[PDB]
């Protein structure tokens, strides 16, 4: 139970009838296992790789619960590493895929401007 | 109700224009009658009377539907699509595609909204017309372009546009037979 999930469920695109392939189901499954392990931080480079080639985490047309769940944990993680970065900078060029995905999800779910990660562009 | 006539024998098939029409008709049924011809002397695309600037003519006619993106900003990308992304020359196309890829670094859509704009339609359609872009997109050389292109392809309005064209050419043959 979270505010972010509640707001996602209030959107129309929430109710679309996506049918996962085995590969998609495997992908949603592995991200929930990472969430359950509490190890999203070690898996951020994997996340960035997924997002390099996929707009949303489970290769969908619209964001799914996987996106929201991973986003809720990843957001504070990412804005910490931006704030603790030695090279503004390199962090941005490297993790740009998580950053564009963060920017989509935070705006979709109407995250407060105070809690929002400011994207440079 | 306007009429958009698409030519199946155009060296550059008017996918952007077709998709624009499909967007309009999905949101506003019976707005545009889509017709196919299959003749090398026919224009690639024709909206009622007009053979020039058809894409912009559709987007400007249906202003409520095509409401997003600063119009000057939209035009930058519509112009890149129409004059650069349709070019079947790897050396030119590579430069053009890097401009698009760079724009997409931190964006899901070309102009950075939560939803696609006419800019996305024009560029996607231009790339779909360009047989050369197939291997480029498939091989993910421009990772952002491939990520973006494969997103819109999943939307039937875009991804089944070719199916519509092929079926309509089938029906054109059938009516002749
Ligand atoms: Cl309209």
From Swiss-Prot, chain A:
This is tRNA-aminoacylation cofactor ARC1. It comes from Saccharomyces cerevisiae (strain ATCC 204508 / S288c) (Baker's yeast). Present with 57700 molecules/cell in log phase SD medium. The gene is ARC1. It is found in: Cytoplasm. It comes from the Eukaryota. Changing residue 26 to R: Abolishes interaction with MES1. The chain holds residues 1 to 121 of 376 of the full protein. Component of a yeast aminoacyl-tRNA synthase (aaRS) complex formed by methionyl-tRNA synthase MES1, glutamyl-tRNA synthase GUS1 and the tRNA aminoacylation cofactor ARC1 in a stoichiometric complex. Interacts (via N-ter) with MES1 (via N-ter) and GUS1 (via N-ter). Can also form a stable binary complex with either MES1 or GUS1 that is functional in terms of aminoacylation. Coiled coil: none annotated. Binds to tRNA and functions as a cofactor for the methionyl-tRNA synthetase (MetRS) and glutamyl-tRNA synthetase (GluRS). Forms a complex with MetRS and GluRS and increases their affinity for cognate tRNAs due to the presence of a tRNA binding domain in its middle and C-terminal part. Binds specifically G4 quadruplex nucleic acid structures (these are four-stranded right-handed helices, stabilized by guanine base quartets). Also required for cytoplasmic confinement of the synthetases and tRNA. Residues 52-61, 91-121 are annotated as: Interaction with glutamyl-tRNA synthetase GUS1. Belongs to the tRNA-aminoacylation cofactor ARC1 family. Residues 22-46 are annotated as: Interaction with methionyl-tRNA synthetase MES1.
UniProtKB/Swiss-Prot annotation, chain B:
It is found in: Cytoplasm; Mitochondrion. Transmembrane segments: none annotated. Residues 105-114, 140-156 are annotated as: Interaction with ARC1. Belongs to the class-I aminoacyl-tRNA synthetase family. Glutamate--tRNA ligase type 2 subfamily. Present with 48700 molecules/cell in log phase SD medium. Catalyzes the attachment of glutamate to tRNA(Glu) in a two-step reaction: glutamate is first activated by ATP to form Glu-AMP and then transferred to the acceptor end of tRNA(Glu). In mitochondria, constitutes the nondiscriminating glutamyl-tRNA synthase that generates the mitochondrial mischarged glutamyl-tRNA(Gln) substrate for the tRNA-dependent amidotransferase (AdT), which generates mitochondrial glutaminyl-tRNA(Gln) by transamidation of glutamyl-tRNA(Gln). Component of a yeast aminoacyl-tRNA synthase (aaRS) complex formed by methionyl-tRNA synthase MES1, glutamyl-tRNA synthase GUS1 and the tRNA aminoacylation cofactor ARC1 in a stoichiometric complex. Interacts (via N-ter) with ARC1 (via N-ter). Can also form a stable binary complex with ARC1 that is functional in terms of aminoacylation. ARC1 increases the affinity for cognate tRNAs due to the presence of a tRNA binding domain in the middle and C-terminal part of ARC1. This is Glutamate--tRNA ligase, cytoplasmic. It comes from Saccharomyces cerevisiae (strain ATCC 204508 / S288c). The gene is GUS1.
